[PDB]
Write a protein that binds this ligand. Structure first.
Ligand SMILES: NC(=O)C1=CN([C@@H]2O[C@H](COP(=O)(O)OP(=O)(O)OC[C@H]3O[C@@H](n4cnc5c(N)ncnc54)[C@H](OP(=O)(O)O)[C@@H]3O)[C@@H](O)[C@H]2O)C=CC1
Ligand SMILES: [Zn+2]
Lengths: 331, 86, 125, 460, 208, 96, 115
């Protein structure tokens, strides 16, 4: 087990956990939680970044002295991937984008980059690879996002046959794009939902649950070639979910049914802007689409985690959106 | 049901072990002549009541106090343990 | 003006020590042995209480020696064995007491070096 | 011998002597002082198993322990056996004994041979140095039989030399005329001389008769030969003649046995079978090697596909022949109980923790018992020492050397068998200094001892 | 004595001895011992019951009038049955003199607060309570003054570890400062400096 | 006297170099490894042995009080040369 | 004999009366503390934490130790009510960032040498 990678200490900041993890996409929303959980137990984290060092500054205090190493990379180059994963025994893939840029479409982000990462990691001798896809990923999905994810799973499995695939369902949290997107609709007055938000059912999952699940999948010896589905405890109709979100935020709720075609047109207008879009054609289709049910897939409970309901963390997420009657669930 | 070993813990100078001591000095040898393959481990307590441990198959152990017993009493206890009757 | 309550002293709930550093620790009460490199005996006068050794590992950066137990450097000094025992019992620490070792007095005789018939006669000096 | 381990930043730096008047006074042997170099070499740091190619490969604790537990559940009784090495503490010995007893296995053996006839290990005084190390200063005649005290017990030899120098102690030896750093009387090499002393024709019988505090010391190395029972019987006859003629001066305890390995007395106290003849008579199918590095039992003496477990701290003659390797702790890395040749129980302290994934030995055995479903009652070191008190209560008295003498019963029980002596001269394993440096697995892994061996064999 | 040796002052020594005998004579109910050091410092060892009287006397007597409280602190000596010794340093401007008053207590026995005698004591006793855990009865408001809020233990006790039991960091998951058990990247190096071959024969203890 | 490890790293004067499987090498990527190029053992091995016609010689390292403590070196052994324990300079008597 | 000077209470009954008074004060204060510090815990689990902290010291049979603990608890309540504590100080009672330590023998044997 390479003596330098033998765990030591009491699992704290200056302990040694025996884990050398390269975390692609660590500067995002789930990346900060994954890096924090890795660093608080004494692992060494290699953080490949393509942005400005200033935007990665917040990850520095997450580890002891020398336990977090920042490295430049870009997804179009295999040599940067190679130099970033040479010495790791764990590779975690978190690269994703909810919109298409002029330089990267869904094909580059969810297919080509994951395939390159998996191939380079397999050539480099990395023991464990953990790839993130979507719960609703399938090759026949209406949205290109999900279709790309399905393709990505196929290529990651082909390049790294022992990779662990994790399929979360609409992660919610303090820096999420779920609760904040639904609560950011106050500016536009009445909320617009296709068919009044009464036809789609969501199963959101807490961010800390997903991060701890990734950590425990690293720890678990037999979770090599398995595929997990990380879902929350409760399923909600979208209408009552948004009603609960607005009630927690103390904001007035005025939901009006909107035509699907009309909604798509609205989404398209947002996309043209250079800056990140509040909504996109793919986004409105993704939030209108119902969450899949995969009972045969091992879940978060199979990793020794009890999923935390949205009712406990909704206040934490939505308190900043201000200036009791939890929603009804369907199971 | 098969006896595996016997242990006799007696104290060197205590009055309560005196009879037990006499037992050895008189007849331990004779017992060993009758049970040449049975281990009877004689060990020393201190500030503690004398004891007799018997170990049976699969690690089962029973202990009986020998405090203030005479030589005949410990002889009877050992015969009862050895013959298997309670 | 006096309660006259009968119970052994116990201050564990007041010292602020975490639970796993009371019941899991094993203190040793002893007179330290003389360093054999020197003949001075001034370091063997008092009683010492010290804690059990815990894990020490290597810092991945700089290779320094890292520890996780807060009592690794704690040593207390006592005048007698009884004082140290009382301190340990009132602090709720399980202890092992080692009796003091005193070098027994010896019979020295310079003239024995030049013995007429005994083997104590030396061949060189 | 009491010692001080000097460490720094989690590393053993040196060994110094610790003063104890009764045992080692102020000195330690060269091996004791300089063999700690081997603690940093050839160490066992991870659990190991056999792969499909038959080679040893690293694995987790769960994998190796489950693999051992499966075979432990598959077989039972006579098919399970264990061997203890020379550096095993009492806690691990009692844990292994309990674990094998829960399988209904009584074949728990030591590599060192002690004769089991008559009393055997039944009476403690039958296998102890009853006079004690300090008692050598009260003796006036000492007879050494088939031993080299200079290399087997250097501090005991130093005590003999001190008594010889200051009390005009008379020393006689039966065996090869080794250099003992003092002059002595060489009675001869043939073991038959013992009988000639017991009969009374040898004038040394008269010399022993006139003595007020006579001493007879028989080494265990002489017991390692096939005549161990007969040699012990002859020495017992000599001591019995001394007591019957010279009378009972009091509590002098003439008979003595000098041991060479640290774990032997504790194992005999716990009821282990001395020697490995039980394994040879009934070969097992699963064999536990608790630090057994003497090479007494190999795969040739075992059935095909015998499952061998080695638990220890050093990679030596016992590890490469094993199917599962469990990394244990050395004596500097645990708080453990050892009983010396006097019968005195003493305890070490943790100086550094075991390296890598190595663990405390009794903890390994307790975890294995839990995985196999035969969980042992004790969970902490205090509970294991309570178990030791239950099995042998003298193992928790940490400086006591006094005990009861049962020489008379053992003497009459030694007159049952009548094994004959061979015409083989008593030759100790350590003939010269070069044989003293390398004896155990720690010393064999030391470069300091290798340099010492090179220096003595050829000198510049 | 040559230039490297501190000069002695017998006049101040005699004066301090005489005043110590005077104080002991006036209050035999509480004064257990009186000492003068070789560098002319006077200490009076008293029973804990006499903290308020003796101090009051030393503050208000025409011949003493020690009107200033320079310092009040505690010393932890674990080998003693009464663990803590309480030390008052008083200054008299009228007679240009200093005095020290010593008493003792254990973990559970309270000591009378002396804020009624000296206002300056108010914070000092608080600090003692923070650092040694000695309770002062009838203190106007006794609470921690130096340690962090919610701090457990009393750091100046001898058995308290140097680095403590908990350390602080910032956690991003909970977005706040958290406290966790201490873990040092480099352990503090304990040095054994005391030599054998005693230094001062005049302080040698009987071998018992 | 800097050498090169088979992996490619410079071996320091203390002889340290991460082995091939060592993850800690990742700390040197996109950066450099600090190695001192002046090896003291080689540099002191280059100093010539001083020839002195005295049985005992004193060495202070040169510079007076700016050197090391003054020590005295015996030169009776002809097989070897006297070496300063502080500075490493070598001294020898004129044999033949 | 064994006569000692009191602190506040002469026997255990007065000590338990003081303990009950402090417990009432903490129980009353919990909801206001939850609202003022904008805690994400519930009032129920805050009162459970108060109960657990009180039960941690349930084995004390010495009245002096009891009312010293009462004094310390009153100091803690004083710190909480006057908002001298911050949110981090209040949340330190819950140990939310510490990974749980298993208690069984096998897990401790696996993680390391620490009992
Ligand atoms: N609701 C959710 O959040 C869900 C997320 N997932 C999946 O989990 C993963 C993490 O999600 P989340 O943290 O929200 O993602 P974010 O959008 O928060 O961050 C993704 C990370 O990938 C990096 N990245 C994006 N595009 C590129 C590119 N072209 N080249 C290099 N790096 C790039 C970003 O770096 P930079 O900041 O420099 O652009 C960023 O750090 C995603 O892959 C997503 O598909 C799955 C289900 C639900
Ligand atoms: Zn020099």
């Amino acid at each position: 087990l390479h003596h330098a990678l033998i765990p030591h200490g009491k699992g704290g900041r200056s302990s040694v956990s025996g884990i050398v993890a390269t975390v692609f996409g660590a500067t995002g929303f789930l990346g900060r939680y994954v890096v924090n959980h890795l660093g608080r137990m004494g692992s060494q984290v290699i953080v490949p970044y393509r942005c400005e060092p200033y935007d990665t500054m917040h990850l520095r205090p997450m580890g002891d002295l020398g336990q977090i190493i920042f490295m430049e990379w870009n997804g179009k180059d295999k040599d940067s991937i190679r130099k970033v994963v040479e010495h790791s025994n764990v590779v975690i893939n978190l690269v994703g984008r909810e919109w298409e840029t002029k330089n990267f479409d869904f094909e580059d982000v969810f297919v080509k980059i994951p395939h390159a990462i998996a191939q380079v990691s397999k050539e480099a001798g990395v023991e464990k690879l953990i790839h993130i896809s979507h719960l609703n990923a399938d090759i026949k999905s209406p949205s290109r996002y999900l279709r790309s994810k399905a393709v990505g799973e196929k290529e990651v499995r082909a390049a790294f046959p022992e990779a662990t695939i994790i399929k979360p369902s609409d992660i919610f949290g303090r820096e999420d794009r779920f609760l904040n997107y639904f609560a950011s609709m106050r500016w536009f007055g009445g909320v617009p939902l296709i068919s009044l938000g009464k036809e789609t059912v969501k199963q959101p999952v807490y961010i800390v649950d997903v991060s701890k699940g990734i950590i425990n999948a690293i720890k678990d010896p037999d979770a090599k070639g398995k595929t997990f589905a990380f879902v929350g405890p409760n399923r909600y109709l979208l209408f009552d979910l948004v009603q609960y979100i607005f009630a927690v935020a103390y904001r007035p709720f005025l939901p009006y049914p909107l035509p699907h075609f009309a909604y798509r047109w609205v989404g398209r207008l947002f996309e043209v802007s250079p800056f990140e879009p509040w909504t996109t054609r793919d986004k409105v289709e993704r939030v209108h689409m119902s969450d899949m049910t995969l009972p045969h897939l091992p879940g978060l409970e199979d990793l020794g985690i009890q999923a935390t309901p949205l009712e406990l963390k909704a206040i934490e997420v939505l308190r900043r959106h201000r200036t009791v009657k939890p929603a009804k669930t369907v199971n | 049901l098969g006896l595996r070993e016997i242990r006799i813990h007696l104290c060197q100078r205590s009055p309560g072990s005196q009879g037990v001591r006499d037992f050895i000095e008189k007849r331990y040898v004779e017992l060993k002549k009758a049970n040449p393959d049975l281990p009877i481990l004689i060990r020393e307590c201190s500030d503690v009541q004398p004891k007799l441990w018997a170990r049976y198959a699969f690690g089962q152990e029973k202990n009986v106090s020998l405090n203030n017993f005479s030589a005949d009493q410990v002889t009877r206890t050992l015969e009862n343990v050895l013959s298997g009757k309670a | 003006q006096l309660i006259a309550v009968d119970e052994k002293l116990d201050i564990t709930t007041l010292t602020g020590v975490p639970e796993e550093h009371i019941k899991t620790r094993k203190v040793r009460i002893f007179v330290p042995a003389r360093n054999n490199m020197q003949s001075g005996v001034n370091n063997t006068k008092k009683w010492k209480m010290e804690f059990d050794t815990r894990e020490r590992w290597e810092n991945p950066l700089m290779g320094w020696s890292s520890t996780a137990d807060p009592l690794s450097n704690l040593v207390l000094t006592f005048s007698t064995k009884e004082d140290a025992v009382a301190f340990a019992e009132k602090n709720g620490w399980s202890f092992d007491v080692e009796e003091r070792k005193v070098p027994k007095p010896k019979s020295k005789s310079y003239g024995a070096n030049f013995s007429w018939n005994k083997r104590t006669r030396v061949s060189t000096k | 011998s009491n010692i001080v381990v000097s460490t720094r930043t989690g590393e053993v730096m040196r060994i110094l002597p610790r003063m104890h008047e009764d045992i080692n006074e102020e000195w330690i042997s060269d091996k004791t002082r300089f063999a700690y170099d081997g603690l940093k070499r050839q160490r066992l740091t991870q659990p190991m198993i056999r792969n499909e190619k038959g080679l040893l490969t690293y694995t987790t604790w769960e994998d190796a322990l489950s693999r051992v537990a499966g075979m432990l559940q598959s077989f039972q009784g006579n098919d399970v056996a264990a061997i203890a090495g020379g550096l095993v503490d009492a806690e691990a010995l009692v844990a292994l004994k309990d674990l094998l007893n829960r399988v209904d296995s009584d074949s728990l053996c030591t590599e060192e041979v002690f004769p089991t006839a008559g009393a055997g290990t039944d009476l403690r005084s039958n296998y102890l140095l009853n006079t004690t190390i300090a008692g050598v200063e009260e003796a006036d005649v000492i007879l050494l039989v088939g031993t080299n005290p200079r290399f087997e017990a250097p501090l005991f030899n130093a005590r003999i030399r001190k008594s010889w120098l200051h009390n005009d102690l008379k020393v006689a030896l039966i065996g090869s005329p080794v250099d003992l750093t003092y002059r002595y009387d060489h009675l001869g090499d043939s073991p038959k001389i013992l009988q000639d002393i017991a009969s009374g024709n040898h004038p040394f019988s008269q010399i022993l008769k006139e003595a007020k505090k006579p001493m007879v010391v028989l080494g265990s190395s002489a017991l390692q030969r096939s005549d161990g029972t007969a040699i012990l019987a002859a020495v017992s006859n000599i001591a019995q003649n001394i007591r019957l003629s010279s009378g009972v001066t009091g509590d002098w305890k003439v008979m003595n046995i000098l041991h060479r390995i640290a774990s032997q007395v504790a194992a005999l106290d716990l009821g282990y079978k001395p020697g490995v003849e039980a394994i040879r008579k009934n070969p097992p199918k699963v064999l536990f090697l608790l630090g057994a590095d003497g090479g007494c039992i190999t795969r040739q003496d075992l059935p095909k596909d015998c499952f061998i477990i080695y638990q220890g701290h050093h990679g030596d003659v016992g590890a490469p022949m094993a199917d599962v390797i469990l990394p244990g702790a050395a004596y500097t890395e645990k708080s453990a109980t050892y009983v010396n040749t006097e019968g005195r129980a003493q305890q070490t302290k943790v100086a550094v923790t075991p390296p890598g994934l190595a663990r405390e030995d009794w903890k390994i055995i307790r975890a294995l018992s839990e995985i196999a479903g035969m969980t042992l009652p004790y969970d902490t070191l205090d509970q294991v020492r309570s178990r030791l008190e239950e099995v042998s209560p003298n193992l928790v008295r940490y400086d006591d050397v006094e005990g009861a003498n049962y020489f008379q019963q053992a003497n009459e029980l030694s007159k049952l068998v009548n094994q004959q002596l061979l015409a083989d001269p008593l030759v100790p394993p350590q003939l010269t200094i070069k044989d003293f440096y390398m004896t155990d697995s720690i010393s064999r892994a030391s470069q300091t001892m290798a340099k010492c061996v090179k220096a003595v064999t050829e000198g510049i | 004595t040559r230039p490297t040796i501190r000069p002695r002052n017998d006049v101040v020594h005699k004066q301090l001895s005489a005043f110590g005998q005077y104080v002991a004579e006036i209050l035999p109910k509480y004064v257990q011992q009186v000492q003068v050091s070789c560098f002319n410092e006077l200490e009076i060892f008293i029973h804990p019951d006499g903290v308020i009287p003796v101090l009051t006397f030393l503050r208000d007597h025409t011949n003493a009038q020690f009107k200033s409280l320079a310092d009040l602190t505690a010393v932890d000596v674990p080998t003693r049955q009464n663990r803590f010794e309480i030390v008052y340093n008083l200054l008299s401007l009228r007679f240009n003199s200093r005095i020290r008053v010593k008493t003792y207590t254990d973990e559970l026995t309270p000591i009378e607060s002396s804020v009624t005698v000296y206002k300056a004591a108010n914070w000092y006793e608080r600090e003692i309570w923070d650092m040694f855990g000695v309770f002062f009865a009838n203190h106007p408001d006794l609470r921690r003054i130096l340690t962090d809020y919610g701090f457990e233990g009393h750091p100046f006790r001898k058995d308290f570890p140097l680095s403590g039991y908990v350390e602080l960091r910032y956690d991003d998951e909970v977005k706040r400062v958290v406290a966790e058990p201490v873990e040092l990247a480099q352990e503090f190096r304990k040095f054994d400096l005391n030599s054998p071959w005693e230094a001062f024969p005049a302080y040698r203890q009987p071998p018992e | 006297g800097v050498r090169t490890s088979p992996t490619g790293e410079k071996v320091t004067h203390t002889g340290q170099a991460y082995d091939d499987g060592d993850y800690r090498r990742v700390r040197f990527s996109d950066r450099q490894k600090e190695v001192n190029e002046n090896f003291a053992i080689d540099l002191i091995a280059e100093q010539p042995v001083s020839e002195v016609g005295s049985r005992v010689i004193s060495c202070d390292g040169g510079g007076g009080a700016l050197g090391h403590p003054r020590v005295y070196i015996n030169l009776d052994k002809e097989t070897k040369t006297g070496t300063c324990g502080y500075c490493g300079l070598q001294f020898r008597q004129p044999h033949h | 004999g064994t006569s000692v000077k009191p602190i506040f209470s002469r026997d255990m009954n007065e000590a338990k009366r003081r303990v009950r008074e402090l417990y009432r004060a903490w129980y009353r204060e919990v909801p206001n503390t939850v609202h003022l510090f904008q805690l994400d815990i519930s009032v129920k689990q805050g009162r459970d934490k108060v109960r657990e902290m009180f039960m941690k010291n349930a084995h004390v049979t010495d009245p002096r130790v009891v009312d010293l603990l009462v004094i310390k608890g009153k100091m803690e309540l004083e710190e909480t009510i006057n908002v001298w504590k911050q949110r981090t100080h209040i949340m330190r009672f819950f140990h939310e960032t510490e990974a749980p330590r298993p208690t069984d023998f096998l897990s401790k044997f696996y993680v390391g040498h620490d009992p």
